[PDB]
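User: Can you write out an input/output pair for a complex, sequences first and structure second?

Assistant: Here is one pair. Inputs:
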Amino acid sequence: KTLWWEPYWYAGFGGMGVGVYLIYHAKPLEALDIKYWAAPRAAKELETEMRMLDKLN
Amino acid sequence: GWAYSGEWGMLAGFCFGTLKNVQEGKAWFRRPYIHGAGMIAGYYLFKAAADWEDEALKRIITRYERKGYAIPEDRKELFAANQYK
Amino acid sequence: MFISVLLILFALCVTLIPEAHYHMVRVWSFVATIIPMWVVTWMWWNFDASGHGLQMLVILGRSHLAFGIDGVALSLMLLTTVLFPICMMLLRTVAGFMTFILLEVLVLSALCVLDLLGFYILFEASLILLFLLIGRAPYGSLEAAYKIVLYTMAGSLVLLPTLFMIYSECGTTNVLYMTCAYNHQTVLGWGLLAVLAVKIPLMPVHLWLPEAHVAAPTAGSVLLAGVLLKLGGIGFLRFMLPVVPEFCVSVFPLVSTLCLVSFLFSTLSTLRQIDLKKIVAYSSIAHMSMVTLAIFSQSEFSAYSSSFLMIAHGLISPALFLIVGILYDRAHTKFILYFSGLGASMPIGSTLFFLFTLGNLAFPLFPNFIAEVLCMVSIFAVHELLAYVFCVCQVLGAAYGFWAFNRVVHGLPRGPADVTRTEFHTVLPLLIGAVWLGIKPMA
Amino acid sequence: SVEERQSFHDKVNDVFKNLTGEAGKRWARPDEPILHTLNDEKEEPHIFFHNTNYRTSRKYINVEKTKILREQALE
Amino acid sequence: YKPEVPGNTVDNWTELRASWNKERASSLGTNYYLNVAVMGFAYWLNEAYYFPPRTLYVGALVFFALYVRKAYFSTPYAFKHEY
Amino acid sequence: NYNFEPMGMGSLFIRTMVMVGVFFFPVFIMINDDYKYTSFLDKVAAAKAA
Amino acid sequence: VFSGAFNTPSSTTAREPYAKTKSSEAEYGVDTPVPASALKAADKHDALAYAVANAPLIGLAGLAAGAQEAYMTFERLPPTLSRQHFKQAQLLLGIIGKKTAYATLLGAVFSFTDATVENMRGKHDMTSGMVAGAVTGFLFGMGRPMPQPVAWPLAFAGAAVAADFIGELMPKYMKDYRIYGPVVHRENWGDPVPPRPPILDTGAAVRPSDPGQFWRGY
Amino acid sequence: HGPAQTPTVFDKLVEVTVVDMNGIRHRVRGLQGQSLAQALVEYGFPDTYFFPNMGFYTQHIVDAHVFVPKEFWGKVQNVDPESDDGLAVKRMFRDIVQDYQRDTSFFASYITLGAEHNGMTVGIGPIKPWILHSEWAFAGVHDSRNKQFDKPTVEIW
Amino acid sequence: XXXXXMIELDLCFGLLLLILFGLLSLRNGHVSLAHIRFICQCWLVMITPLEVQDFALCILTVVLLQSFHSFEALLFLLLAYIGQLYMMHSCNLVSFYVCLEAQTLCVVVLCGLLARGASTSFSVEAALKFLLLSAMVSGMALFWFSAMYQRTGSLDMVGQETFWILLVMLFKLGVAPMHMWSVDLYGSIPKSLLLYLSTAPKLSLFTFWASSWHHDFSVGVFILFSMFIGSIGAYGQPALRSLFAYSTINEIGLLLLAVETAGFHTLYQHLGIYIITQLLLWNLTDKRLFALCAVSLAGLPPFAGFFGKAWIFWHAMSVQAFSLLAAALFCTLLSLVYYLRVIRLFWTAPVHTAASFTGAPNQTTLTSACAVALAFAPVMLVKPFVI
Amino acid sequence: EAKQFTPDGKYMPGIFSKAKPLDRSTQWVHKNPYIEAWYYRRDHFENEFVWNYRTTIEALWFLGGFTAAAYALSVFAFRQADRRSGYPKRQILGDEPAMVLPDERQFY
Amino acid sequence: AYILDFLSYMWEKNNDDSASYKEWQDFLDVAEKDRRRDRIIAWRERTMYDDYAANAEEPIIYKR
């Protein structure tokens, strides 16, 4: 016999886990976290500051 | 006046009838005429409360300005308003 | 807001259920707590880390009640909404369902509050609920409820004059304007320190918790362990630092020394405990002190580290309480000298006891390890002496932990057999969550 | 003066009340902070939040730069 | 498990009976006297409110300290035949 | 043959101090570094104003 | 507002102090006259006069307590003893006088020692009150069992510290505190200026510490 | 477990001679584990023979004033004079009894009858007038026929 | 012209008609007087001026008239209400004294008459004690009033003599240590009369204070007396009657504290909340709601007692009355002990409610359940409402 | 040996079964009176406090002494952190008006 | 895989920056309204209703 609580427990917790996986693997990188938003914007600044440093040498 | 005052009054009347049946050992849903009358009473009473807030606020702005405490018109709208907040 | 009101009314329908159909009673009571978990999941899917530091803003007119979401509040809501269904799974009375529903509602409302008066009103609305919960007639202790209620009321009464004084000073009670006005930081700061040092267990005024969390049943025990202490940390983060920084600064030596002595004495006191439940009670004190010092450090990433540690404790410690509750209910006693040979008697349960003991002891492959690493990073950047003090006494907690575990688990087999399907299911969310957050918490 | 600061506060409220942007541009991620002559910048909350978000962006950009330079150093 | 009540039952009951074989008078007189005292001398504290807080708190601590509880009040004078 | 009694007060105090000294040496090292540094500054101040 | 990176108010402070905030059109207080005896009571240049003028208030509490205990003892007197009116009077009056004199001595000691320390240290702080409280507790606590001779000085010293904190320290810390009109350091917020301070019929216990707090009277 | 005799009420039967304030002896049957005053109510004593308990969370408990002879003094369960329950008992002495106090004055609510109590004899102790609330008071006169056992409830309110 | 004084003539005519009507109704062998009760309510409605306080007191009394069934007591309550209403209009100490003494005599008579059972003797004793102390207080008031009349030569209520007028005003509210008469009254008198006392004279005296009273002194030491004594006594008294008595003493001390720092809006709202609670208290038939009164008195957040104490604390801080604010906080804490005790005594208990036998089946369900709906009040309350 | 179930499930309470029914209380221990007294005493150890010589000596030398040690250590760490960031003296609680919260707009 | 980017596109379509900014502005505006109103109301004198001088601006009629 299946216990009374088993289907509801499974449904709720599996739904939360599915939502978690979909958040971590389908939300846009910028939407998921800020750290993705800043990488392309900082890469160019680092690029153009590297030559500034080299000329300072 | 508040937007949902009458709904709050009806909910209060609902609980009122519930606890009236509680106080007599009856099921919560018995005697629905009491529920309806209480809903009407709560709706009208809290509408009166909402209107009384506006009355008191107009009294406040009038008294404050009459004493000599003149206000820039921008904040007078905080008191001279029958806002349906 | 509309959805929240719908859940509020839907949860109240429990009392309207006639007691004849017990099956549907359990189903409804469980589902009412199930729904907010999915709602918070939907919120997290709706949040934007590239957006503002606050999102999903809503205000209920001139009635205070300012609700907004940061990462800390959302994570705390997620952890609480995970915890509550397990607590529901451990109750058998409608009164318990109603009390825990109201407690969950109050916790959720306070978790995203943005009005200091609103936090004051909403937080301590559950004090009578805790009083009725802890001092139950057949098994509870009235003294524990008396203690905790008096401590909380004392804190709130100390805070209230400060709250109304700053309200009059700035003309409002919203944080985003309280944070922008000049104010007499000192008095409000003392009020906030008093309340959040009572709520979070901090020496000397912390003594209610060891009696309270032990006298309460399993569900209330897990609630008190994993929720109400974190109300203190989110309290700091949301209110005290944004509002009164100068008081926070001038009190930093006092806060640091109080946290350090709290941690030291609690760690040393734990070894002399003779009951598993009391041992678990003292365990949380060190974690809360570490969280408080991490918050007050503000060095590099203090808020995030504190949130990580709060989540880690609210994940692991309820598992300790679950094991304690299972052992007591299927043993009718909590006294250590009646526990022996548990591994041969309760293989999977004893394995879980081991795993969650290691979780309490900050070991790798667990969120607590990264949490304490980040907290000690924040502490170290402020100064290295405090970080050393935290680092040096790591052995002293694991001492009592391993001693109690080995004493009760190994040896002569005597007592209950292993756990049941319901008990393993109750254990399951904490294990999965801890593994997930100790392997790849971020991405 | 008091009247000068009153006028400046009113102008700031006007400017922030009528402010918008498009083309996938996320507000609270502005390219520039607004220069000011205001002591205790919290005197203007809008400017305070603008500068807060700019500072957050700069800090996370520093973190990303640190990661990139760490990768190059490892290489 | 139950802890034991300390001491002897006989001795403790006798202590329970210490200074209680006496008729209770009417509470009217104490009430009238309190009201009379308030009506007659409370004006003495009129100048008090301006006084420095330190002295007022000292007076408050003294007044609290010297108080005697009306309930369970007993004297050796209740059961002696002469002064 | 055990009486279950707390340790000797003086011995307990002495061993507690011994433990504290052995296991909190960085505190003393940092404090003595600061003391030496301020002594250097004091000598510099004394000699530089004459 | 809320990010895990840092806390913005921790780095947003003023560079220059502000001037005085204009509160009302008329910027002077209105208050009732203080009796000069209490004005002499605040005088602290002479310890002897300070204690002398401070004593009667302190001894009044002892008088009240003595009257309480004496009347309670009376309401239990036997009929045989109550007819010795002279003896009744002498006993009750002895109780009352003992209590009142003890209270007076305690208060005189407190005031004398407090003003003594105030003159000795050439400045004013809470330490003088701490010394006075400790001495008063010791004098009160001498000759009793021994959880007391430490506790009573602690009680008196803590009471003195609380008295300082409440009566003097906090109002001085909030001498500029205002609940009306423009907010200090935030007069850019457009709050109108009242012509006059809010007139309030506050009791003698509620007195304005500053001319700009409110107006007291009717 | 063997031929052990069937359980009958005789084996737990306790008898106490109780004499009223009018000097009339009365035979009363008592049971082990129950209070004396409960049986006293069960006998038909007038409501004037009883009074509310003056303690906290016990004001629903009735009691009667009796005198315990010298022998049975040690069978009275001990109560701490320093305890809050002891304070309630001392309030009961202070108010109800006044100058009716005797060194044998005791309260039946603390008498748990047993084997030794068989054959014990006590009498009723006089009390002063009292009032608790609107529905339960004592005029000071023992002129009544209403049985305390006839009250449907004990309303502390 | 008397054309502007019609309503007082109406009061007199209605009283005469009521006297004759009551006389006639008694010759018929009638045994109930609900018709008389409704007629009295109507006459109260008509004689009421258009002030908010006047209507509040009128309606409060109107609900209270359902709790009595004797014609003479109805008449006494009508005359006491007349005295109270005209006390809200008393511009001089003569009418003030007359109204106070009429109310006192009415209270004494009402307490004396309605006794039944063996409780009668103690009710008589308490009533006589209150009469004697009221007589001496009245004599004090007359003496000092005559002294003021001599010094001023006018009807102005000013000068040093007003201190004793303030004292007499204190005595009517049971201001500790002039509180014990209230405790004695709580000890014996039936619940209906105590229900009357807690609401009406206090309301009228607060209104008259707010309208026509000023003094050049403080009452803070008396506030300390009331707060501390009420808190400690309500903690220490096992009797429910005296427990609520000392609770009332603490609440009136809180009201006095609100008074001393002005800001009568919080005073008004807290008085209204407390009167609502008292109305809910003395007509209780089920004990489950009894703990709601405690949580509405212990200042627990979600209900009105908390906010009523809260704005009071707000206004106390508005003047930085640190001393009395801290004292009020500590006494509020001490309240919680016996309030939780009340909760234990009448919440964690088996549910039982006796059924009516002589008809009148739970004759006060409506007012009870209506007063219960106070959890919905804070919605309208949190805004600047009462001001 | 009892039958608390039917051949098709259907848990039977077995109220009138002669055999002792297996239940939740089945594996309860038999309490040891000495153990119960010990655990009550340790849960109610609060009645054993007294201001003796040893207790006072221990409380002052350890509790308050190490409280003072940690307080002074915190003060030292705070001041050293201030000195290691180029800041002047800062105003701790009760330290006379001085610099608090160094501005983000100033280079120290 | 396609499901993941489908969800991403659904999110990006549904979300709006300007709506959130307007919500933020509404929050600040309402909060400032309430704070201004409360601060104005705080200028609360309190004298007895017989105080003619303190209420010389009140249009009150007496029937005495």
